[PDB]
TrEMBL record:
Annotated keywords: Monooxygenase, Oxidoreductase
Coiled coil: none
SUPFAM superfamilies reported in the protein's UniProt record: Dimeric alpha+beta barrel (SSF54909)
Name the record gives this protein: Antibiotic biosynthesis monooxygenase
InterPro entries noted in UniProt: ABM_dom (IPR007138), AI-2_Isomerase_LsrG (IPR050744), Dimeric_a/b-barrel (IPR011008)
Keyword Oxidoreductase: yes
GO molecular function: catalytic activity; monooxygenase activity
Domain of life according to the entry: Bacteria
Domain ABM: 113-201
Species: Fusobacterium nucleatum subsp. nucleatum (strain ATCC 25586 / DSM 15643 / BCRC 10681 / CIP 101130 / JCM 8532 / KCTC 2640 / LMG 13131 / VPI 4355)
PANTHER family: ABM DOMAIN-CONTAINING PROTEIN, QUINOL MONOOXYGENASE YGIN-RELATED
Amino acid sequence: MYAVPILNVYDFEVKKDKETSYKSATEDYVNKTMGVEQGVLGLFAATDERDKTTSYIVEIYNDYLAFSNHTKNQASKDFKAVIPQIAEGNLNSAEIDVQIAKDKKIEQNDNTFAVYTVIDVKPENDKEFAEIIKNIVETTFNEEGTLLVYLGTDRRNFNKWCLFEVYKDIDSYLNHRSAKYFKDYITQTKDMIAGKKRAELQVLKIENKGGLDYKKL
């Protein structure tokens, strides 16, 4: 309640002939972390296979102490020991000031559909946009089939909004963006945006506590 949630999104390029090792090590990491550690709200491993296979792992913790303990616990020590053998390069990480974080408990299946969007808003239009996207993301969570929406701003630059969202199935996601409220939003914010990268992602392993319901005061 009085603690600030920690939301970090890690990404990196996977070596050509190491997809197998990558999947195994990420599965173990997600399973050993959530099964044993405290203060971990959820971990979400996905993959972008377009051009060059990229790993994405969305990690969310209750506070910075929970996070600091995680980086010292066994799951992470084992995984960070394997990254160099399976990573080609890049190795980026976005740290995010969470604006809205809402979820249900996810039991992944073949239909689970994850998307990650990054939106560079023009600084001139940031105030107005913030209130707009906040509303849209809340409307989305109440849509049937939405399992998770994490919305926040990069701590390196608050004009960079980051949206991670999980749906029960691909139809739920398409119905979401073909809805009047979302189409209207695209039209309304068109000239407020500087750049946008949406990445439909291939789910790898997801585990979470569920029931999260947070909003920055």
